[PDB]
Amino acid sequence: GMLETPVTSAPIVATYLSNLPAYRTGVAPVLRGVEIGLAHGFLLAGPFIKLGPLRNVPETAEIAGSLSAAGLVLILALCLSIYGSAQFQSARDPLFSADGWSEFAAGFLVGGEAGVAWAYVCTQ
């Protein structure tokens, strides 16, 4: 069969993945979308603020960077939505279905924008 390896087949690694929102079955797709969106949205603000074109402005740097992070989350939400449209047109987990993914994309937008807003509040 496939080449066995500790990275591919280890107990500690398997348990960690099984607890991630993507693999945690039994949770509504919308809730998983919010949990995933919040984590990525919070991180997405970092690089824009520190290395953006308006990084050296004292107060505008925080606003401009976070506002660009919010924009990228919006674009990503569109990518999630159209992916579901193309992939699911006609199985065990509700997420991998036309109904499930549409809820998942909506949750990501709500969670992602909340994370970007929450990141801004931390700064000011």
């Binding site: 080449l3 290395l51 074109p53 050296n56």
Partner: protein, 742 residues
């Protein structure tokens, strides 16, 4: 316990010109003679492919052994010519008197069709082509002071060349070693470690201690070369040597009584560069070769041959067995004693990597007198030995794939290191694939980021020392550690091994020989370009070796062979799947990667090291513009290629006008090659049909049917012309530039 012994066969082959008159005799396919022009190319392509002429390993080994004598004989003719031309067509004797003002020259052209203009004014009342091979500096270091000494070496070189060709004939036609002789790897390593490298180093130490050191000590003192004692007078008269080095007054008793400190006057550990000549101390070099001689002579007593003591190489390999690697190194000993290609793959890899290491160490620690201040020699030697190393490494991939197709046998390799590597090749190539993509974005993308920010009028947004900074902190730490080594970690060394680490510059004849090299943001960016282009070359070559036998596209690629064009247009198209084609593609990337290496060296040296010393300070050739300009692609185009190519394009009408012609001619050959790379033989075979019709119409059609080159030969002809044109273009550009200003 097969004894190690000499074993030959008497008169294996007859010496006759009969087969010289029967082209293709070596191969069954070509022995029948030509019917199409394809036969002619096949004759030269398969001439030295011994492994395919016969399936007998003994017959293959005997041809390899004698073909090596022919290579040695050719080098001696070449070496003899270099020494002879130094004696008869050079200004070496004048150069010894005024090394800092006279340009070395050892080639003279005849006065025909107006080519005598190439005999430039080089100094010493001599006209000739300036040479960048560094032979004058080598001869001075060894102690050569007259053209008679050069002449005798050339005559000795021809005698050695005759001996080498006799040996090849003798050991193929008269007394050919048997296969069991060739397979004494333990014995060969013992002799080559302690005998070739070991005694060779000791013998050269004898020359340096007795000839080079006394002669160069007086030359540096200003003594006229003609008034220096001859090397044999130094050897016969211990009184003379005692004057230069008092340690000689005690003879060899200190060596045998272990009072080795008595020889401190000529066996030194100074470090640094000789201030008078700008090269390494020869007393340091002598202690180096004496130390190296002992290390290798000890190394030559490690393997067991006939007297029990020693190691068995098979036993070492089979003992190194771990939990993560299955059987381990089992089966490698049989692979490496029955496959010439496997041996060649290893040796080319390390021999090529060694040639690249030589280039870095020789420029940073100039080992010859007046080598450093001769910028043309420094640039040429570094660039020459980088190109040699590059080609050898690509060959290592080529002959690793040949082993994989021809000499690989699954029965002998089951669950060993070799087998397990093949069983996760997708994991290796997929990861190496991602690393190359990552390195391409985060190294070349930075240049594109800088070029766009600069064009938009946003210099503060660029990656540079005056902007967002990328300091090679790790390299800078190592430079400082080596600079302070003599204080605490190498107490008995007087100076740092190189002046690149730090300290003060050494100037010879008003020119900088070596000074500290600073690493900044531009150096950070260029180095990660090197890592990118090297990693890609590994990807192409390693992919060819791992997928030589099969892939998910061609499950039976081994049966097709090592060198085939494709498996047809099916499966979407299978052009260039053979392992030979991975060498073909790997050659382009090796050329791409080494071109940046020699551009990096050329611009960094001119900008930051080379220059003229004056009262105020050091003025460099390009005035320190590397730091601010080499962070954009536009900077390289304008400041390096466009500005420095001024010398080559203005060469007409001068002694350097030859470089101008070759600069254009090289551009031509390179573009000519794209005809073979961008086309296919289907078009050309149809074109020849119409051309053949015209000859048939005139009863002048050849008997050997014209054929368009094969698919593989089109790719081989393309890459050979592409490399020759590209490399020759840089060669002309470098020499016309550095000779003109350097």
């Amino acid at each position: 316990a097969k004894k190690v012994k000499i074993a030959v066969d008497r008169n294996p082959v007859e010496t006759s010109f009969e087969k010289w008159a029967k082209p293709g005799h070596f191969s069954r396919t070509l022995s029948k003679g030509p019917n199409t022009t394809t036969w002619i190319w096949n004759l030269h392509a398969d001439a030295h492919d011994f492994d395919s002429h016969t399936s007998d390993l003994e017959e293959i080994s005997r041809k390899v052994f004698s073909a090596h004598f022919g290579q040695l004989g050719i080098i001696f003719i070449w070496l003899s010519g270099m020494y002879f031309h130094g004696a008869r067509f050079s200004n070496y004797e004048a150069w010894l008197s005024d090394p800092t003002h006279i340009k070395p020259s050892a080639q003279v052209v005849w006065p025909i069709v107006g080519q005598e203009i190439l005999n430039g004014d080089v100094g010493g009342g001599f006209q000739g082509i300036q040479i960048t091979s560094g032979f004058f500096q080598l001869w001075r270091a060894s102690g050569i002071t007259s053209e008679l000494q050069l002449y005798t070496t050339a005559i000795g070189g021809l005698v050695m060349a005759a001996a080498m060709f006799f040996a090849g004939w003798f050991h193929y036609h008269k007394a050919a070693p048997k296969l069991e002789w060739f397979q004494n790897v333990e014995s060969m390593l013992n002799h080559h470690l302690g005998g070739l490298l070991g005694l060779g180093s000791l013998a050269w130490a004898g020359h340096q201690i007795h000839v080079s050191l006394p002669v160069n000590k007086l030359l540096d003192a200003g003594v006229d070369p003609k008034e220096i004692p001859l090397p044999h007078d130094l050897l016969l008269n211990r009184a003379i040597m005692a004057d230069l080095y008092p340690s000689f007054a005690k003879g060899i008793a200190p060596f045998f009584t272990l009072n080795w400190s008595e020889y401190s006057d000529f066996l030194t550990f100074k470090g640094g560069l000789n201030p008078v000549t700008g090269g390494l101390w020869l007393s340091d070099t002598a202690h180096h070769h004496v130390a190296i001689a002992v290390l290798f002579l000890v190394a030559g007593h490690m393997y067991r041959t006939n007297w029990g003591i020693g190691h068995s190489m098979k036993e070492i390999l089979e003992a190194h067995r771990g939990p993560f690697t299955g059987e381990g190194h089992v089966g490698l000993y049989e692979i490496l004693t029955t496959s010439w290609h496997a041996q060649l793959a290893i040796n080319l890899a390390l021999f090529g990597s060694l040639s690249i290491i030589v280039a870095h160490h020789m420029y940073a620690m100039p080992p010859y007198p007046y080598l450093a201040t001769d910028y043309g020699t420094q640039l040429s030697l570094f660039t020459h030995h980088t190109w040699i190393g590059g080609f050898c490494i690509v060959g290592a991939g080529a002959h690793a794939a040949i082993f994989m197709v021809r000499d690989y046998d699954p029965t002998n390799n089951y669950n060993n290191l070799l087998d397990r590597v093949i069983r996760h090749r997708d994991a290796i190539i997929s990861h190496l694939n991602w690393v190359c993509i990552f390195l391409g974005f985060h190294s070349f993308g930075l240049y594109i980021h800088n070029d766009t920010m600069s064009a938009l009028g946003r210099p503060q947004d660029m990656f540079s020392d005056t902007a967002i900074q990328l300091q090679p902190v790790f390299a800078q730490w190592i430079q400082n550690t080596h600079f302070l080594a003599p204080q605490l970690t190498a107490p008995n060394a007087l100076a740092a091994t190189s002046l690149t680490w730090g300290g003060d510059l050494v100037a010879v004849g008003g020119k900088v020989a070596m000074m500290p090299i600073s690493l900044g943001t531009s150096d950070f960016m260029v180095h990660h370009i090197h890592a990118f282009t090297i990693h890609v070359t590994v990807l192409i070559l390693l992919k060819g070796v791992l997928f030589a036998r099969s892939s998910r596209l061609i499950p039976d690629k081994a049966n097709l062979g090592f060198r085939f064009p494709c498996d047809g247009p099916g499966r979407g198209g299978t052009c260039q799947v053979s392992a030979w084609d991975h060498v073909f593609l790997g050659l382009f990337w090796m050329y791409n990667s080494l071109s940046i290496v020699i551009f990096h060296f050329s611009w960094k040296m001119q900008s930051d090291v080379w220059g003229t010393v004056t009262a105020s300070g050091v003025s460099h050739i390009t005035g320190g513009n590397f730091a601010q300009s080499a962070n954009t692609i536009n900077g390289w185009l304008r400041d390096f290629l466009w500005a420095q190519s001024s010398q080559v394009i203005q060469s007409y009408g001068s002694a350097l006008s030859a470089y101008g012609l070759i600069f254009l001619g090289a551009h031509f050959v390179w573009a000519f090659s794209l005809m073979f790379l961008f086309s296919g033989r289907g078009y050309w075979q149809e074109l020849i049909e119409s051309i053949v019709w015209a000859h048939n119409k005139l009863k002048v059609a050849p008997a050997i049917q014209p054929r368009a080159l094969s698919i593989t030969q089109g790719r081989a002809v393309g890459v050979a012309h592409y490399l020759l044109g590209g490399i020759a273009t840089t060669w002309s550009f470098f020499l016309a530039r550095i000779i003109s200003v350097g």
